Amino acid sequence: GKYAQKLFNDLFEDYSNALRPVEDTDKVLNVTLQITLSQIKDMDERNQILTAYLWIRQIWHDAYLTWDRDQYDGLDSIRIPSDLVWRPDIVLYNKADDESSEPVNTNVVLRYDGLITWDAPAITKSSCVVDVTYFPFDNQQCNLTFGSWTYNGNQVDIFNALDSGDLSDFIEDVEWEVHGMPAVKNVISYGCCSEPYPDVTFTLLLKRRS
Amino acid sequence: GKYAQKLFNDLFEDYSNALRPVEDTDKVLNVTLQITLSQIKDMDERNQILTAYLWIRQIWHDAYLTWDRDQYDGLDSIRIPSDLVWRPDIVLYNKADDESSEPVNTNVVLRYDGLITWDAPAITKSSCVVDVTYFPFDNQQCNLTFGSWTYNGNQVDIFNALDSGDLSDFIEDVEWEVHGMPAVKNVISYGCCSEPYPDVTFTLLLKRRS
Ligand SMILES: CCN1C[C@]2(COC(=O)c3ccccc3N3C(=O)C[C@H](C)C3=O)CC[C@H](OC)[C@@]34[C@@H]5C[C@H]6[C@H](OC)[C@@H]5[C@](O)(C[C@@H]6OC)[C@@](O)([C@@H](OC)[C@H]23)[C@@H]14
Ligand SMILES: CCN1C[C@]2(COC(=O)c3ccccc3N3C(=O)C[C@H](C)C3=O)CC[C@H](OC)[C@@]34[C@@H]5C[C@H]6[C@H](OC)[C@@H]5[C@](O)(C[C@@H]6OC)[C@@](O)([C@@H](OC)[C@H]23)[C@@H]14
Ligand SMILES: *[C@@H]1O[C@H](CO)[C@@H](O)[C@H](O)[C@H]1NC(C)=O
Ligand SMILES: *[C@@H]1O[C@H](CO)[C@@H](O)[C@H](O)[C@H]1NC(C)=O
Numbered sequence: 001g002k003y004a005q006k007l008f009n010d011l012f013e014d015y016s017n018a019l020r021p022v023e024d025t026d027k028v029l030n031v032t033l034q035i036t037l038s039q040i041k042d043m044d045e046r047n048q049i050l051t052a053y054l055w056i057r058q059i060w061h062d063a064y065l066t067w068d069r070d071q072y073d074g075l076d077s078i079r080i081p082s083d084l085v086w087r088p089d090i091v092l093y094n095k096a097d098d099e100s101s102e103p104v105n106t107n108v109v110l111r112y113d114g115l116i117t118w119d120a121p122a123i124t125k126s127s128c129v130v131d132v133t134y135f136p137f138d139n140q141q142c143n144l145t146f147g148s149w150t151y152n153g154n155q156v157d158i159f160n161a162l163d164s165g166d167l168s169d170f171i172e173d174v175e176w177e178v179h180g181m182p183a184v185k186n187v188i189s190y191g192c193c194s195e196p197y198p199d200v201t202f203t204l205l206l207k208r209r210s
Numbered sequence: 211g212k213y214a215q216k217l218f219n220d221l222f223e224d225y226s227n228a229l230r231p232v233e234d235t236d237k238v239l240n241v242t243l244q245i246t247l248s249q250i251k252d253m254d255e256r257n258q259i260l261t262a263y264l265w266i267r268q269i270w271h272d273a274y275l276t277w278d279r280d281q282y283d284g285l286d287s288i289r290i291p292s293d294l295v296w297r298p299d300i301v302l303y304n305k306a307d308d309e310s311s312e313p314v315n316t317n318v319v320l321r322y323d324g325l326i327t328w329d330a331p332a333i334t335k336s337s338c339v340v341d342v343t344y345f346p347f348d349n350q351q352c353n354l355t356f357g358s359w360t361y362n363g364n365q366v367d368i369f370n371a372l373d374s375g376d377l378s379d380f381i382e383d384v385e386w387e388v389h390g391m392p393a394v395k396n397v398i399s400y401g402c403c404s405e406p407y408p409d410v411t412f413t414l415l416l417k418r419r420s
């Protein structure tokens with residue numbers, strides 16, 4: 001039995017990873033986003049830049065990658081290279097650099113109901129602002145703002161999977177403690193009649209250790 | 211031929227101005243907002259407060275105030291005191307004072323298809339920020355941010371009627387010229403699962419006259 005092979009061949013026989021996988025163009029595709037903070041690599045106070053190591057988990061539905069489990073011997077999920085499927089082009093809007101790191105290879109897990117889960121590591125560089133005004137009163141506020149590069153909110157709509165950045169895999173920094181990393185979702189539209197532009201923003205608040 | 215009286219009695223026989231006028235409470239009510247800037251009453255640079263005179267036009271559909279024109283001898287619109295109908299409780303979120311004007315009497319125009327139009331004057335007081343960085347390089351940025359006080363975005367959703375503040379009725383200020391008043395719509399939601407909170411913001415940019 002080569003059921004996974006057969007399923008793969010059946011699924012991608014006529015599949016384009018360039019196309020937002022909705023049946024209807026003016027229907028939206030929803031993506032949830034989870035940010036896991038691995039490590040504060042550097043809080044540069046000279047240039048006010050945070051370099052962080054992150055994991056990004058994106059979850060969405062692909063209308064064209066579903067199957068009947070009964071036709072494939074009960075097989076209900078497969079893990080494949082991520083570049084085989086359409087992926088949301090979510091990026092850090094407020095990146096401080098135009099520097100491009102070489103893309104690590106990643107995989108997606110594809111479930112029989114078209115549910116796709118994608119974990120990817122990332123090094124981010126972004127500006128922070130000193131804050132000595134709000135509790136705990138000796139801080140660096142480091143916003144991380146994420147969204148689609150090319151799709152508006154009626155094409156790809158983005159949601160926070162969690163109330164905050166995920167700190168459960170975090171390794172402590174000797175100089176900075178993480179006070180909080182609350183997540184919000186912003187949507188802006190211009191004038192009467194523009195398309196909506198959503199983001200999710202994590203406000204990483206760092207407290208200077210004493 | 212007292213058709214307007216007959217219509218009024220028929221419309222308001224069993225009507226409550228306390229209830230958001232949707233047939234299904236889980237459905238949204240859409241409101242469009244137009245701001246007309248009448249006058250800059252005071253640009254207080256000591257306290258960084260703008261006092262402005264505005265007209266606010268709100269338009270929305272009332273599901274319970276529709277009628278068949280052909281049943282009322284073709285009557286298709288009536289003008290009545292505004293406190294007779296449910297009204298959106300849109301307010302200036304970023305008001306600077308406790309501390310409001312005594313409310314004046316206003317009217318709404320009610321169209322046969324349930325479309326209600328409501329003009330009301332307002333005196334607003336709000337903080338501004340000095341800006342000498344961006345063109346035209348000697349400015350006051352005065353944001354005016356409006357939204358419902360008690361309803362979230364799934365209950366009452368607000369939209370800009372125009373691309374900008376309406377300046378067609380504006381009387382010039384001797385000290386300040388209006389450089390622009392672009393309008394945007396912002397929506398924020400907190401964490402994974404909160405309701406959405408929309409506003410419309412007018413960024414009134416004032417240029418100092420030399
Ligand atoms: C295709 C690249 N794309 C990147 C953009 C980038 O958007 C952002 O950076 C951004 C989005 C929401 C909130 C804040 C944002 N932001 C930041 O956080 C930093 C940066 C200054 C900024 O604008 C994504 C959304 C939209 O594309 C769907 C853009 C807008 C759509 C439209 C707008 O034209 C003015 C605008 C674009 O300029 C080009 C487009 O022209 C067809 C775009 O490049 C981005 O503008 C910043 C903006 C477009
Ligand atoms: C009922 C009064 N209402 C006024 C508020 C006030 O909202 C704002 O001032 C506001 C809204 C959007 C964007 C920016 C806003 N804002 C500010 O919050 C400060 C600044 C002046 C400003 O512009 C409207 C939205 C929501 O109510 C539907 C509120 C929130 C809903 C919820 C939130 O608490 C968890 C929050 C409230 O505190 C109370 C509520 O608890 C039942 C509320 O009073 C306002 O918070 C500022 C906020 C609520
Ligand atoms: C996208 O998410 C919103 C909010 O949960 C939901 O109402 C809508 O039906 C979703 N649309 C699709 C196509 O999944
Ligand atoms: C950081 O992001 C939060 C959430 O969007 C926002 O309220 C705050 O103003 C941002 N901080 C700065 C300095 O822009």
Ligand SMILES: *[C@@H]1O[C@H](CO)[C@@H](O)[C@H](O)[C@H]1NC(C)=O
Binds near residue numbers: 237238239240
């Ligand atoms: C509210 O407005 C949007 C257009 O922006 C529309 O799609 C939606 O159907 C409207 N809802 C109601 C109840 O009018």
Ligand SMILES: *[C@@H]1O[C@H](CO)[C@@H](O)[C@H](O)[C@H]1NC(C)=O
Binds near residue numbers: 339351353394413
């Ligand atoms: C004024 O409002 C605009 C539009 O929402 C916003 O981008 C800008 O940051 C605001 N300015 C200040 C000083 O809050």
Ligand code: NA
Binds near residue numbers: 159160185399400
């Ligand atoms: Na959110």
Ligand code: NA
Binds near residue numbers: 393395
């Ligand atoms: Na708008």
